[PDB]
């Protein structure tokens, strides 16, 4: 039951925020609807969910067109998958957020392809904080340079950081890795304008990420099933 699962997930978010002295409103729930049908999204919308994350461009754009066509207003779509240059125009024309900026050329393409009448595309720079197997994300040492370049792109808005840590079962390591991101986020936030988003945490490490300072958790399985 999607409605029931949304309520249950929001309950555990709220508790984890309150337990570590944070307001529940500090945490945005991003419902990851990738691989799920539009009808499952429509259920979530009827249950009050408004922010959806998609991993594949054409799948996401098709859904966005579907709900725009029903005149369903007020949604926020986040592209959270790796972005190839040949699909950037579709992202730039349809999505509200992109979490996976890890090279300047893809950001400049998105900026150039973003219609001027739209709001600037909110972007996060993706950090490979702990996954030796992943091709995605930059090293932290590259952050200052990339953030500076991205920040001048007028049709993008740099909002913060994202990371997909390597899978980790120990709470202690989940926390310390998320803290590495939170420290980097805080340092960016002191010099850059409108840094307010740390996209960090999924179903299995949600509590450590929230304790560490995440502002946005990306939940799929716990809402829609795997
Ligand atoms: C970036 C990102 N966030 C979240 C998820 C899903 O998280 P979970 O199903 O563990 O809640 C995935 C896709 O599986 C993902 O690629």
Numbering used by the authors: 3 to 228
Direct quotes from the study:
The pyridoxal 5′‐phosphate (PLP) homeostasis protein (PLPHP) is a ubiquitous member of the COG0325 family with apparently no catalytic activity. Although the actual cellular role of this protein is unknown, it has been observed that mutations of the PLPHP encoding gene affect the activity of PLP‐dependent enzymes, B6 vitamers and amino acid levels. Here we report a detailed characterization of the Escherichia coli ortholog of PLPHP (YggS) with respect to its PLP binding and transfer properties, stability, and structure. YggS binds PLP very tightly and is able to slowly transfer it to a model PLP‐dependent enzyme, serine hydroxymethyltransferase.
We serendipitously discovered that the K36A variant of YggS, affecting the lysine residue that binds PLP at the active site, is able to bind PLP covalently. This observation led us to recognize that a number of lysine residues, located at the entrance of the active site, can replace Lys36 in its PLP binding role.
